[PDB]
């Protein structure tokens, strides 16, 4: 019931499937999918992978879980969730994050562990998938593949400095000091036309305070691909990764990395006349995991 | 907010 618009994802069903996969994953399944059953271990394969990982996550206190998508392919009940994850990055990733938080708090509660749930529910957990299929290069990504998980490998040529990214504006009313904080949604900030107070109403009382806004890290990394396959007469191509938050300042120049993330496209403004955008979209990649 | 009926497709 209740699939989201423009997608094939149902929140309840996807959360159910992800919880099922978390509860009942054993590495022997991946061994079966790898046709490596002759290497099946009695110890590690028996033990529940992600439950244990969530445990050491709880004791250590980390907030990020790295998920192998081929493990999702291994589990029969979540084979469809794999394709749902490729085709719909952001929605399914948020679903996974909520499910991780739910599983953490549930596991604490069920065992009645002395560890307090104050930190757990306040924390924000992130899921970082990887090993999501093949590479296919960048010459072979058609525009229909916008906002999908892609796997890229190459050499990190150049790394820009840290670029602050606005998260909350801090407009201040000059007249009645009505300092409202505006969160950014879908990269848009909406100015109060007049003073949001009813008693005080002065449109010119607003003057954004740059310094008291809350920002977030953003680093652009120039990656030159080294695809496993190269078409005839194709010189190497450079793509612009865009990392966020903790991944900033992680990848140094000269590192040979394999990166997975969301293949995005953004209009580029023709600066000849302001607020006029070119019809050709620039393509870049948001980064979720770096190996 | 974006929730719609499931009869659209499968």
């Amino acid at each position: 019931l209740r699939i989201i618009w423009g997608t094939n994802v149902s929140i309840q069903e996807c959360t159910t499937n992800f919880r099922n996969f978390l509860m009942s994953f054993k590495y022997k399944f991946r061994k079966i999918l790898d046709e490596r059953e002759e290497f099946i271990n009695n110890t590690t394969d028996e033990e529940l992978y992600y439950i244990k990982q969530l445990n050491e996550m709880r004791e250590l206190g980390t907030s990020n879980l790295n998920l192998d998508a081929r493990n999702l392919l291994a589990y029969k009940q979540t084979e469809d969730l794999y394709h749902q994850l490729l085709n719909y990055p952001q929605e399914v990733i948020s679903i996974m994050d909520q499910t991780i938080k739910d599983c953490m708090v549930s596991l604490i509660v069920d065992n009645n562990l002395d560890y307090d749930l104050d930190e757990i529910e306040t924390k924000f957990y992130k899921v970082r998938p990887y090993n999501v299929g093949s590479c296919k290069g960048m010459r072979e990504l058609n525009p229909n593949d916008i906002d999908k998980l892609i796997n890229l490998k190459g050499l990190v040529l150049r790394s820009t400095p840290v670029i602050p990214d606005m998260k909350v504006a801090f407009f201040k009313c000059n007249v009645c000091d009505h300092t409202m904080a505006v969160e950014i949604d879908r990269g848009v900030i909406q100015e109060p036309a007049r003073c949001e107070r009813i008693d005080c109403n002065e449109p010119n009382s607003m003057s954004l305070i740059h310094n008291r806004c809350s920002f977030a890290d953003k680093q652009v990394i120039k990656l030159q691909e080294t695809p496993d396959f190269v078409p005839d007469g194709q010189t190497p191509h450079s793509i612009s990764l865009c990392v966020y938050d903790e991944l900033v300042d992680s990848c140094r120049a000269g590192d040979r990395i394999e990166v997975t993330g969301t293949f995005r496209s953004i209009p580029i403004r023709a600066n000849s006349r302001q607020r006029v955008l070119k019809s050709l979209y620039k393509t870049y990649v948001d980064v979720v995991h770096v190996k | 907010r974006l929730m719609v009926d499931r009869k659209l497709g499968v």
Binding site: R139, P143, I146, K148, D232, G233, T235, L280 | -
Partner: protein
């Protein structure tokens, strides 16, 4: 009505729409209707492109006229005004689209699921409005009309997945038949469906071009679409939803890239062939626009006959030069016919199967394919065999440790001036699907080029290399090899022995891929060969470079009473009749030869134990022979393991030539014979 007058024109779009619909429904010549079956395949999400064959339309017209029924000239109308008929065909198809028989199975493209969601939503809106108006209780045709007038559906432009393209008339069956040079594409041809024959120069990489940007108003829960048909557009900020427009409540829009419509975009910039340029002029280029599933079909250094609509575009040049409504033009590509079939596109269908059978069943494939290379050249049989082996190429091995072997041959044609060396390079250029003819010192002064320019369409810097990168998976016929400077020789060192180019100049730290077979032709030192000097001094090639060449023919010029009179007879006959003299064999035209070569390239033969023993013994004997005469008058160079590798490569190529997956002992014997007789003319 006075401001915008009217003109009566012979075309009637309604009658032509009826003709289009009838043609789509009732064309059977190619059990069921061809285009109905194609539409069914499209509905099942198999085909994304509908190719409207104009020859089918012509045959439909001929059938209708032959039986006596009057059918208007649809083909002529399409050729005269192609752009409008694209939308006419698109709407006719959209009316006649069948329904899918295979639903979404969680593995379908996100575009397909979005289209299905939109279709179901607008159908639900239509039915709901019908139910409401029927329940109001104020014929179902009037009800349908009022509900379709009163509802805001997703337009049919946003519920089609297929792409529409026109195929021009074949010349043999029959304007679009006759290809035109860029020079002849005048201003009279705008809006027509023309065929431009030329060589593709500079193809940009695929980038998404937005067609219908889609927004969402969170307040009113609508989705507003803004069509874009310009190189530049202005984004929307205030809601255009009718209900949200009347409501005075503030609304804000947001871009939804997943909801917006995109088309794969590419620009190609075809030039003129050298033959088309009139005397004294230089070739000039013409932009090509590629949209939809036609992208990646055009590559630099391709001889093609692109058929497309010659649409104009608003001028973007200087206002001073603009005097009037000046417009810059382009050709929206519709059909691409490669003049030379690539080797990587080969497919063993019956069409190639019958001719391949015809070649092999007649037998003597090796001799026929060797003689068929430049039949006007006389008496140079061994070098022709070597060039054929160059065309076929050996097998490249990739050991699991990461070790890689070339699997490609390199032939050097040393020789006295006037022995038709440069002619064979041009013949190979005309046979090979890809190739570059570099020559001299000034020309192609940098075969390796560390060029990083800017792409005009996309601001991101692209890397450009010399002829070597353009000759990827091809033959880089190099002429006047000895006169080439030392820098290009050092680059060609790596290009021959490996298949990569390593660049560490200012701005570029990369490694280009050039798996190119080098074919060279250079004169010996001091012009002609001097038998006083040692052969290794006449060649003037350092042992590091000389080892790379698998076969290095000497092709010395020595007068003879018999051979020269035979050659004179051959050349004089060629000048008299523009044909190969003898009637013993008919030469294989480059199309058939290229097809057979592709078929042979498909095979990957493997060596044999006894074959391996024979090759090992031969290599040992050759090494001993080189050691013995290390300073004799005939020291053609000490043998190296590259000689063994070249023997293996030649044997594999010869095996490929017979269409065999198993290397034969006689093939190794013939390869040894060729390697030995490459220097036989020295005596």
């Amino acid at each position: 009505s006075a401001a915008l007058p009217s003109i009566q024109l012979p075309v009637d779009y309604n009658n032509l729409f009826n003709e289009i619909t009838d043609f789509l429904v009732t064309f059977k010549q190619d059990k069921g209707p061809k285009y109905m079956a194609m539409l069914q395949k499209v509905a099942n999400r198999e085909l994304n492109s509908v190719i409207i064959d104009l020859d089918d339309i012509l045959q439909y017209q001929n059938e209708k006229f032959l039986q006596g029924t009057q059918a208007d000239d649809l083909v002529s109308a399409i050729q005269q005004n192609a752009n409008h008929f694209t939308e006419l065909f698109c709407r006719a198809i959209d009316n006649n689209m069948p329904l899918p028989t295979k639903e979404i199975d969680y593995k379908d493209d996100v575009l397909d699921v979005i289209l299905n969601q939109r279709r179901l939503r607008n159908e639900r809106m239509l039915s709901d409005r019908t139910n409401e108006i029927r329940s109001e209780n104020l014929m179902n045709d009037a009800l349908r009309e009022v509900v379709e007038d009163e509802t805001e559906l997703f337009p049919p432009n946003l519920t089609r997945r297929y792409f529409l393209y026109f195929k021009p008339l074949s010349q043999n069956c029959a304007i679009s038949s006759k290809p035109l040079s860029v020079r002849q594409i005048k201003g009279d041809f705008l809006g027509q469906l023309i065929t431009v024959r030329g060589i593709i120069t500079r193809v940009s990489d695929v980038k998404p071009a937005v067609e219908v940007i889609a927004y969402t108003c969170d307040q009113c829960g609508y989705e507003v679409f803004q069509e874009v048909n310009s190189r530049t557009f202005t984004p929307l900020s205030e809601c255009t939803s009718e209900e949200c427009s009347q409501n005075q409540t503030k609304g804000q829009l947001f871009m939804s890239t997943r909801a917006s419509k995109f088309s794969a975009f590419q620009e190609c910039k075809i030039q003129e062939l050298s033959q088309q340029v009139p005397v004294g002029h230089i070739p000039r280029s013409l932009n090509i626009h590629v949209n939809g599933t036609l992208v990646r079909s055009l590559s630099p250094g391709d001889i093609v006959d692109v058929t497309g609509i010659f649409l104009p575009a608003p001028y973007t040049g200087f206002k001073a030069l603009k005097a009037g409504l000046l417009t810059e033009t382009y050709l929206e590509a519709q059909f691409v016919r490669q003049h030379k079939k690539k080797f990587a596109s080969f497919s063993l269908t019956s069409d190639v199967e019958e001719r391949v059978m015809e070649l092999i069943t007649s037998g003597d494939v090796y001799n026929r394919l060797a003689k068929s290379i430049a039949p006007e050249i006389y008496g140079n049989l061994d070098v022709k065999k070597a060039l054929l082996l160059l065309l076929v190429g050996g097998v490249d091995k990739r050991v699991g440790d990461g070790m890689k072997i070339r699997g490609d041959i390199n032939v050097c044609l040393m020789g006295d001036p006037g022995v038709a060396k440069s002619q064979l390079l041009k013949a190979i250029c005309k046979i090979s699907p890809r190739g570059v003819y570099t020559t001299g010192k000034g020309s192609s002064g940098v075969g390796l080029t560390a060029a990083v320019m800017k792409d005009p369409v996309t601001d991101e810097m692209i890397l450009e290399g010399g002829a070597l990168v353009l000759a990827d998976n091809g033959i880089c016929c190099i002429d006047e090899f000895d006169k080439m400077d030392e820098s290009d020789r050092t680059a060609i060192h790596e290009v021959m022995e490996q298949q990569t180019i390593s660049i560490s100049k200012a701005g570029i730290n990369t490694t280009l891929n050039a798996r190119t077979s080098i074919l060279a032709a250079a004169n010996p030192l001091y012009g002609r060969y001097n038998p006083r000097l040692s052969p290794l001094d006449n060649i003037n090639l350092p042992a590091a470079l000389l080892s790379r060449f698998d076969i290095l023919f000497l092709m010395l010029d020595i007068p003879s009473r018999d051979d020269d009179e035979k050659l004179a007879e051959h050349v004089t006959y060629v000048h008299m009749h523009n044909k190969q003299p003898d009637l013993d064999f008919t030469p294989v035209e480059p199309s058939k030869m290229r097809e057979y070569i592709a078929y042979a390239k498909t095979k990957r033969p493997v060596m044999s134990e006894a074959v391996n023993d024979y090759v090992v013994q031969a290599y040992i004997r050759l090494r001993q022979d080189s050691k013995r005469e290390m300073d004799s008058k005939f020291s053609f160079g000490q043998a190296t393991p590259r000689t063994l590798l070249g023997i293996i490569r030649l044997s594999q190529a010869l095996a490929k030539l017979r269409l065999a997956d198993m290397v034969d002992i006689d093939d190794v014997e013939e390869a040894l014979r060729l390697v030995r007789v490459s220097k036989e003319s020295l005596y």
